[PDB]
């Protein structure tokens, strides 16, 4: 049954072989609601598909473990754990029990995780510079959207640097909230006209008669949760109709009261009123004559992030314009994005903001929708840089994979006993990573494999190789011959992603080998 369970996983394994890498294939997902979507990330595909088979549930639950704590490695945990079961087939047919196979991977896992600390090349200084963020974000954009890697590099790195404050050697105060970076898309135009602005972006239209405010800095903003209406009594206070004589007093009564309430509020100096609920017809006409911008925000989630930016606080009541709770904004205007004029929120060189929004433009919404998921995964890659050894990095694109194979085979001969068979098969399972990039790129697999081992195996006067550790697995697409160095384009995967993906894929692979029988009964 273990062999039969691998065959079912092998069908799922081949699905991820065409996923990882910039040359991979995308799969169309047709939802039961009549919506056709397509995405590169395999973790989204597992959510729309119903998982049943128990050996498949192990890799799916391990995939959700990769979604938290990081945004990269969704295809890494699936391909690595899937190959460990394929190389274990030779041990099962040989007659070796699956118990010692699991024990062999546990000994090789501790030797692998310990070597990753000594294989580090550079370390991120956490300078939060625009050029420093281009090294981490550029390889993350790759393998998802092709051709936008160089275009989206300057857009994502500039928006993240605005959220990240200026600090050094301080790990006590947490930062980098997930919702602080919002990605919106507008149909039409292209990515060349996209810029990076500090503030929230609203897609609602300026229903008020004031399209844009003045150029004076520090405009007060009043966030009102209670809708605009005549002041009522907290106890009962239900308006009832009796005779036609009282009908004239209802319209004339609310006309003077609403005009008097907005009067004193507008006289406090606040030029912007944010109403989280519906706005009345009579109350809208009064604020338009006083030069007050009316902005409705029905979403309660957008009002929470605004408190940390402008400084305003939502008031559950109406008619109490407290100046201590008012915020400040330099410029509030209405710009036309993609043909539609929407009121935006921004500031210049003041009142530092922890929340930013990226404005994107594109002709085709299909590929543009995947850009939002690619940037959201790129934002989560910034989380990989933390105080507990977050700045450590390793060369990617198959450079570390093949180089680690030669170091594992050295530990195999040094460890006596039956563990030698498990150590050798553990290093061979890493050959799926270079073959994945070589097969999806159209290059000959038999040509690339010997050229890799020839670069990683050299004769030097010493036990530590010096000159070139940077030889990777290159996607050529060129005419004749030659490759590129990892340090040239700075395309690599961080250590926090690789160390976490291998540790989870190792336990997930040994978990499938533990269950040799399934039993289903009525609950």
């Amino acid at each position: 049954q273990i062999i039969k369970s691998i065959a079912a996983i092998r069908e799922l394994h081949q699905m991820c072989l065409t996923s990882m890498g910039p040359c991979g294939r995308n799969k169309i997902i047709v939802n039961h609601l009549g919506k056709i979507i397509i995405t590169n990330d395999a973790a989204t595909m597992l959510r729309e598909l119903d998982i049943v088979h128990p050996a498949v549930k192990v890799l799916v639950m391990a995939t959700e473990q990769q979604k938290i704590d990081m945004g990269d490695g969704t295809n890494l945990v699936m391909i690595l754990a899937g190959e460990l079961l394929n190389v274990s087939e030779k041990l099962i047919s040989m007659g070796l029990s699956a118990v010692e196979i699991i024990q062999g991977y546990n000994m090789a896992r501790k030797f692998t995780l310990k070597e990753l600390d000594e294989m580090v090349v550079g370390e991120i200084t956490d300078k939060n510079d625009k050029n420093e963020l281009l090294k981490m974000i550029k390889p993350v954009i790759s393998s998802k959207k092709y051709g936008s890697e160089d275009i989206l590099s300057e857009l994502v790195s500039e928006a993240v640097s605005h959220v990240l404050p200026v600090a050094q050697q301080a790990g006590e105060i947490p930062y980098f909230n997930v919702d602080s970076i919002r990605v919106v898309k507008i149909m039409g135009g292209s990515l060349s006209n996209s810029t990076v602005i500090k503030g929230m972006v609203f897609n609602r239209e300026p229903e008020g008669h004031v399209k844009s405010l003045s150029e004076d800095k520090k405009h007060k903003v009043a966030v009102f949760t209670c809708p605009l209406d005549i002041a009522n009594t907290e106890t009962k206070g239900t308006v009832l109709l009796h005779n036609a004589q009282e009908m004239l007093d209802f319209s004339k009564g609310e006309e003077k009261q609403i005009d008097a309430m907005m009067k004193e509020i507008a006289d406090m100096g606040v030029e912007c009123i944010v109403a989280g609920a519906g706005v009345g017809e009579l109350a809208l006409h009064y604020l338009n004559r006083y030069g007050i911008l009316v902005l409705k925000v029905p979403s309660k989630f957008e009002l929470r992030r605004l408190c940390r930016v402008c400084g305003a606080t939502p008031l559950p009541r109406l008619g109490a314009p407290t100046p201590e709770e008012l915020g400040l904004v330099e410029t509030v205007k209405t710009m036309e994005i993609g043909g539609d004029r929407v009121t935006v929120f921004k500031q210049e060189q003041g009142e530092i903001s922890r929340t930013s929004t990226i404005i994107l433009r594109g002709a085709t919404q299909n590929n543009l929708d995947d850009i939002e998921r690619a940037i959201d995964d790129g934002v989560a890659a910034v989380k990989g840089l933390m105080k507990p050894s977050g700045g450590k990095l390793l060369p990617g694109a198959g450079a570390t994979e093949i180089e680690l194979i030669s170091r594992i085979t050295k530990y195999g001969e040094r460890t006596p006993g039956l563990l030698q068979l498990a150590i050798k098969q553990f290093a061979v399972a890493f050959e799926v990573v270079p073959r994945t990039l070589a097969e999806t790129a159209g290059l000959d697999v038999n040509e690339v494999l010997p050229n890799l081992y020839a670069a990683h195996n050299v004769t030097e006067p010493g036990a530590v190789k010096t000159d070139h550790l940077y030889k990777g697995v290159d996607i050529d697409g060129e005419s004749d011959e030659g490759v590129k160095d990892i340090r040239e384009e700075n395309i690599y995967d961080m250590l926090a992603t690789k160390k976490f993906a291998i540790n989870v894929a190792t336990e997930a692979a040994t978990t499938v080998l533990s269950i040799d029988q399934i039993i289903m009964a009525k609950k």
């Binding site: 995308n26 799969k27 997902i29 397509i38 002709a363 697409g477």
Partner: protein, 507 residues
């Protein structure tokens, strides 16, 4: 698996095979039966493909590029779908030999980079050189009308086509601003151009034959509510406890209607437009006051009246403000079309017009209606876009030529891919000859002879079968078509070939 990619290619061929005869003005048309049972016949590939609603996922990709082709450009929706699927048809034997589809998809964008730089070299900017304002619109109008039954009557049709685009702003032009109403009966050469909007003469009620046909400066008013007393369908139930109150309520309902009637009388609006039918009480009262009223006005027809005289519709007859009224230059109801039709003429503020056509059958006029739309799209893109290239296969044959020589200078697998890309471009001129009935074997071979002699302007003559130059045939196309087609076809081809598995969830 590899069989799923091949199966997705053959699924796009069935959709492409239907759109092949629709390429060209003389090509065949697709007959689609909608679920609503309404039958529509048109040669425009946009509306056609939108009615398929194919469940297959790769067929939806051709729909997305068709909407962008109709939005940003508006012309060439048929050719962009054929070219997007042709690259997958020629790449079918390439996948059987073991060549990965990635290098095939990457090789397409390599030729596009050389094609974009080629369009700029073939783009010639000319406006006032060897031409004028009237001669530019007159010579280009007879080209789209060629090979049609209107070619003999095209002398009167070009004069109306030039004045159609001159009645609108030259910076912003829209083909929807010119309306076309099919009028059965009458000669086809007796049609005229109208600046305003016309009605359908739906009035079945007595009182006709009495009306002046010429107004000086009438006032136009739009009313959103109907005014009637006793209709021809419903009735009124009046039940009271008094005998003398029976006639009182009947007279009371007459006074409530007469209220809103005399309010318009004090305003003095000679034209009354309402989306709801008007009873016989208002039509009889307005006869002595020389006030015209039109009931059951279409929604799309009344919306164009707002942009015509600059007025607006009001709910009641009480609070109507003076700026809602409007006045035209002349109002004339003629016998054109063997029926009396009323229409507006001489509106200086009108942002829309209507072009009336006549003919023995409505289906024959529909063929002329779609033929006039092709001449409007040429003028629409000739104003904003100053780059004009030779169409009708001229530029298409030039792109394939130069790419064949670039393959010999590029070593590697890209030699056979670019050569196959240029070979796949031959489907556009082929199908144009196969639709009209020309021989694809002789013409395509005879065209490649002089095409290599250094002259890049050689096109395909659509009138008499022969090789020739489209510059003398006055066949022109904007440079935006060639740029948007190559970008939409490459993106659609690379998207379908990149799908190795079709996942469909049911529930």
């Amino acid at each position: 698996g590899k069989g799923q990619i091949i199966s997705n290619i053959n699924a796009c061929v069935a959709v492409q095979e239907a759109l092949k005869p629709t390429l060209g003005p003389l090509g065949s048309d697709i007959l689609i039966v909608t679920s609503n049972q309404k039958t529509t016949i048109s040669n425009d590939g946009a509306t056609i493909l939108k009615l398929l609603d194919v469940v297959h996922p790769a067929a939806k990709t051709l729909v997305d590029i068709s909407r962008a082709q109709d939005a940003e450009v508006g012309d060439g929706t048929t050719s962009v779908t054929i070219l997007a699927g042709e690259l997958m048809k020629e790449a079918k034997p390439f996948l059987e030999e073991g060549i990965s589809s990635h290098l095939i998809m990457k090789g397409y964008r390599k030729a596009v980079s050389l094609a974009v730089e080629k369009i700029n070299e073939l783009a010639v900017d000319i406006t006032s050189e060897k031409s004028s304002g009237r001669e530019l619109l007159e010579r280009c109008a007879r080209t789209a009308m060629s090979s049609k039954l209107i070619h003999n009557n095209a002398d009167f049709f070009v004069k109306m086509c030039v004045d159609a685009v001159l009645s609108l702003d030259r910076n912003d032009l829209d083909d929807k601003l010119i309306g076309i109403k099919k009028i059965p009966g009458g000669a086809m050469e007796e049609s005229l151009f109208i600046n305003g909007v016309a009605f359908k003469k739906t009035f079945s009620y007595a009182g006709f034959e009495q009306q002046p046909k010429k107004f000086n400066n009438p006032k136009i008013l739009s009313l959103n509510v109907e005014l009637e007393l006793k209709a021809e369908k419903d009735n009124a139930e009046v039940r009271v406890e008094h005998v003398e109150d029976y006639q009182a309520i009947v007279d009371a309902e007459w006074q409530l209607i007469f209220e809103k009637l005399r309010q318009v009388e004090e305003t003095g609006a000679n034209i009354v437009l309402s989306k709801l039918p008007i009873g016989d009480l208002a039509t009889q009262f307005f006869a002595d006051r020389n006030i015209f009223c039109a009931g059951r006005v279409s929604a799309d027809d009344m919306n164009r009246v707002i942009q015509a005289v600059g007025g607006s519709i009001q709910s009641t007859t009480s609070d109507i403000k003076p700026e809602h009224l409007g006045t035209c230059a002349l109002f004339e109801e003629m016998q054109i079309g063997s029926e009396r039709y009323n229409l507006f003429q001489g509106c200086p503020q009108a942002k829309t017009c209507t072009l009336l056509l006549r003919g023995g059958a409505e289906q024959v006029i529909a063929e002329v209606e779609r033929s006039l739309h092709d001449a409007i799209m040429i003028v629409k893109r000739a104003l904003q876009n100053k780059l004009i290239v030779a169409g009708g296969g001229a530029t298409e044959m030039e792109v394939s030529k130069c790419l064949r020589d670039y393959s010999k200078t590029i070593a590697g697998k890209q030699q056979m891919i670019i050569n196959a890309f240029a070979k796949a471009l031959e489907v556009i001129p082929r199908q144009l000859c196969e639709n009209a009935g020309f021989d694809a074997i002789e013409i395509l071979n005879k065209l490649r002879l002089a095409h290599s002699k250094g002259e890049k302007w050689y096109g395909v003559v659509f009138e008499t079968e022969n090789i020739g130059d489209n510059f003398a045939k006055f066949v022109w196309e904007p440079a935006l078509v060639k740029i948007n087609a190559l970008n939409s076809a490459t993106e659609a081809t690379n998207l379908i070939l990149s799908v190795d598995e079709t996942i469909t969830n049911k529930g």
